[PDB]
Amino acid sequence: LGSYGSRIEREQHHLIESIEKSTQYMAKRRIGALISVARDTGMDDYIETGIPLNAKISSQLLINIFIPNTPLHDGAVIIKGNEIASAASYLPLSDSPFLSKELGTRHRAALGISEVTDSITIVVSEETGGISLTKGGELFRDVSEEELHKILLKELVT
């Protein structure tokens, strides 16, 4: 609880900064990433699919998880509460015919989880390095640093 109105407000700003730094690092290096931040819905069903970490949130841990050809890189990192709950979780795929065919199953899975939960999911493309975000069944494609920070600030701080 430093310089913020609560411990919780501080932890949420730490979560935002960890997501920003990690995606920035992984985007430059064309590293695929899938980070889904649970909110009100509760995502215990999909945490059980992956490998449980229950680890403190940091930009460095988020990077090491998605390094290619490593035991944790294929799947989704799910953040629940104030910790990284699991890695290598699989998400439901959206059946939307409106998803661009330029986007692979990683983008299609992030859309799938946004349709059935009120979570925020962040995607970094292996092909292009573009950062994308899904919420409420809607995808924002190739967002900027400024645009991403505005969405995370709006949707992840309470």
Ligand X SMILES: Nc1ncnc2c1ncn2[C@@H]1O[C@@H]2COP(=O)(O)O[C@H]3[C@@H](O)[C@H](n4cnc5c(N)ncnc54)O[C@@H]3COP(=O)(O)O[C@H]2[C@H]1O
| Cα angle for residues 154, 6, 136 (degrees, 5° grid) | 25
By the rule CB under 8 A, 108 interacts with a copy of itself: yes
By the rule CB under 6 A, 116 interacts with ligand X: no
By the rule CB under 5 A, 74 interacts with Co ion: yes
By the rule CB under 6 A, 122 interacts with ligand X: no
**Distance, CA of 5 to CA of 33 (rounded, Å):** 31
Q: Binding residue for a copy of itself (CB under 8 A) from 9, 39, 104, 156?
A: 104
- Each residue 104-143 as x (binds Co ion by CB under 5 A) or -, in order, gives x---------------------------------------
By the rule CB under 6 A, 26 interacts with ligand X: no
By the rule CB under 6 A, 111 interacts with ligand X: no
**Distance, CA of 108 to CA of 83 (rounded, Å):** 25
Strand partners, 139: 134
| Amino acid found at 133 | L
Q: Tell whether 115 is in a known binding site.
A: no
Q: Check if the beta carbon of residue 87 is closer than 8 Å to that of residue 72.
A: yes
| Cα angle for residues 18, 20, 25 (degrees, 5° grid) | 95
| Cα angle for residues 104, 106, 111 (degrees, 5° grid) | 100
By the rule CB under 8 A, 27 interacts with a copy of itself: no
The distance of closest approach from Cβ of residue 97 to a copy of itself in the complex, given in angstroms and rounded to an integer, is 8
**Which of 46/152 has CB closer to ligand X?**
46
Q: Check if the beta carbon of residue 112 is closer than 8 Å to that of residue 93.
A: yes
By the rule CB under 6 A, 106 interacts with ligand X: yes
Among positions 87-106, residues that touch Co ion (CB under 5 A) are: 104
